[PDB]
Amino acid sequence: KGEELFTGVVPILVELDGDVNGHKFSVSGEGEGDATYGKLTLKFICTTGKLPVPWPTLVTTLVQCFSRYPDHMKQHDFFKSAMPEGYVQERTIFFKDDGNYKTRAEVKFEGDTLVNRIELKGIDFKEDGNILGHKLEYNYNSHNVYIMADKQKNGIKVNFKIRHNIEDGSVQLADHYQQNTPIGDGPVLLPDNHYLSTQSALSKDPNEKRDHMVLLQFVTAAG
Numbered sequence: 001k002g003e004e005l006f007t008g009v010v011p012i013l014v015e016l017d018g019d020v021n022g023h024k025f026s027v028s029g030e031g032e033g034d035a036t037y038g039k040l041t042l043k044f045i046c047t048t049g050k051l052p053v054p055w056p057t058l059v060t061t062l063v064q065c066f067s068r069y070p071d072h073m074k075q076h077d078f079f080k081s082a083m084p085e086g087y088v089q090e091r092t093i094f095f096k097d098d099g100n101y102k103t104r105a106e107v108k109f110e111g112d113t114l115v116n117r118i119e120l121k122g123i124d125f126k127e128d129g130n131i132l133g134h135k136l137e138y139n140y141n142s143h144n145v146y147i148m149a150d151k152q153k154n155g156i157k158v159n160f161k162i163r164h165n166i167e168d169g170s171v172q173l174a175d176h177y178q179q180n181t182p183i184g185d186g187p188v189l190l191p192d193n194h195y196l197s198t199q200s201a202l203s204k205d206p207n208e209k210r211d212h213m214v215l216l217q218f219v220t221a222a223g
Contacts, residue, residue: 002083006035011113014062020122023052029062038068040217045210054136055213056164059200061103063116067196067219076191078156084109085184096173099125108183130172137165140200149190155181194223
């Protein structure tokens with residue numbers, strides 16, 4: 001059963017290939033998830049050299065199966081219900097006054113390792129805007145992620161807004177439109193409307209010379 005795969009600490013591997021305004025890059029990530037505590041620890045490395053977009057703009061793209069669902073809300077956890085076969089996660093991320101990311105990922109088990117395998121395409125970015133001109137602070141706010149059932153597609157629709165802080169006190173809005181559908185045949189839980197409360201801490205390994213991001217995340221389901 002899907003939820004039983006997450007009762008302990010689960011190794012995580014993330015692999016992203018990106019192209020934003022023709023700037024190609026790849027990111028690999030390793031760490032672990034403890035869904036009992038809603039906890040994720042991951043270190044991401046840009047394997048192609050310098051990341052051509054700010055690290056924070058990738059956080060949402062780079063495993064909502066690691067959310068903590070309280071006991072009373074267990075019947076609303078789509079993400080674990082689809083495992084081990086997994087789900088497809090697709091998004092469009094509209095950066096206000098700027099370009100968009102379109103992403104397709106498969107989140108599934110490969111042996112004991114939970115894998116997030118992603119392709120990302122960014123288009124219509126301004127070369128001196130907040131994204132390509134690297135004007136976003138290396139930090140991350142706490143958000144509510146709003147989940148609803150999509151019966152027609154046997155999955156979920158997810159919508160939320162990320163606010164990336166800029167030095168002058170303004171924000172770069174990143175409007176997220178998301179859908180998840182199962183990879184496998186088997187039964188999945190289609191939830192009633194609810195949200196995930198998220199928080200993320202970004203940091204650096206002072207002795208890592210590669211372009212990278214260390215991430216600590218806690219996510220709990222509510223309502």
